[PDB]
Amino acid sequence: DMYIERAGDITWEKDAEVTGNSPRLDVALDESGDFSLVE
Amino acid sequence: GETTDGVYRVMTRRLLGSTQVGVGVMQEGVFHTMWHVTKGAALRSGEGRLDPYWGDVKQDLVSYCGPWKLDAAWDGLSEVQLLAVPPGERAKNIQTLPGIFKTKDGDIGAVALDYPAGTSGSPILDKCGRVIGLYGNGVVIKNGSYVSAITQGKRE
Ligand SMILES: O=C(Nc1ccc2c(c1)CNC2)c1cc2ncccc2s1
């Protein structure tokens, strides 16, 4: 049985940790909502 | 129960202890999450019940108490922040520049950040604090890491 709990306000934080790359990938989306890589 | 705007954890007591299966956004009295988090099942908020209102397995989105309210979009240029709510850990903003998912039906933003599967439904924000999409549906790359799409719904 599922329940929800508050975890915070939705705001932008100035000087948050900046990480992660920006990959450009060829993908396909099937009828079940699952993504897959096309190569 | 609690209908204040904000980010919420989606929890279950079906498995061992209390387990976090995902996250969602409360905005304008509507709860927004990814379909794979709840599978369209009802939710509890204190003593109150939240019933599903709209959902789609292909978009992997679901709204409760009313129609989908989030309509902001990534501008295709600027950095964004993932407001990650990891299981058992405090909400944390992480800024990143999104990549691109190129599909036969158009391009979609993508964030390359790795978090537990129980973080699915965490919102992605623009510099004004607007929710431009939810994190949790994407693909696994060569090294085993995840790249999620910036999944956004349509506000009717
Ligand atoms: O498996 C996942 N997501 C998902 C599950 C079931 C379905 C869909 C997506 C869409 N169709 C049904 C993951 C989300 C995630 N986040 C960060 C790191 C690793 C993962 S794996």
Structural domain of B117: 80-149
Domain match, B142 and B91 both: yes
Contact call for A18 and B42, based on CB within 8 A: no
Q: Please report the DSSP string for A26-38 in residue order.
A: EEEE-TTS-EEE-
Smallest CA–CA distance, residue B35 to chain A, in Å, is 9
φ, ψ of residue B97 to 5 degrees: the values are -100, 120
The CATH number that applies at residue B97 is 2.40.10.10
Domain match, B109 and B143 both: yes
Does residue B74 belong to any structural domain of this protein? Answer: no
Whole-angstrom CA distances from B51 to A38, B18, B41, B63 are 37, 21, 8, 9
Which residue on chain A is closest to B47 by alpha carbon?
A3
Could you give the CA distance from residue B66 to residue B54 in angstroms, rounded to a whole number? 8
Q: Can you tell me whether residue B36 is helix, strand or coil?
A: helix
Contact call for B44 and A22, based on CB within 8 A: no
Domain match, B93 and B48 both: no
Domain match, B55 and B86 both: no
Residue ending a domain, among B64, B90, B106, is B64
Does residue B133 belong to any structural domain of this protein? Answer: yes
CA of B127 to the centre of ligand 1 (A): 26
- Residue A31: which region, alpha, beta or left (left: phi > 0; alpha: psi -120 to 50)? alpha
Does residue B139 belong to any structural domain of this protein? Answer: yes
**A27's tokens:** 């993908």
Domain count, chain B: 2
How far out from the chain centre does Cα B154 lie?
Answer: 14
Whole-angstrom CA distances from B30 to A13, B5, B6, B67 are 24, 9, 11, 7
Whole-angstrom CA distances from A24 to B12, B101, B120 are 36, 6, 22
Sign of CA dihedral A12, A17, A21, A26: negative
Domain match, B93 and B58 both: no
**B20's tokens:** 């976090």
Which residues are paired to B48 by β-bridges?
B45
Residue A9: CB partners within 8 Å, gap ≥ 6? B5, B6, B7
Domain match, B59 and B86 both: no
Does residue B72 belong to any structural domain of this protein? Answer: no
Contact call for B129 and A12, based on CB within 8 A: yes
Does residue B75 belong to any structural domain of this protein? Answer: no
Domain match, B93 and B131 both: yes
CA of A28 to the centre of ligand 1 (A): 15
Experimental method: X-ray
Could you give the CA distance from residue B91 to residue B108 in angstroms, rounded to a whole number? 25
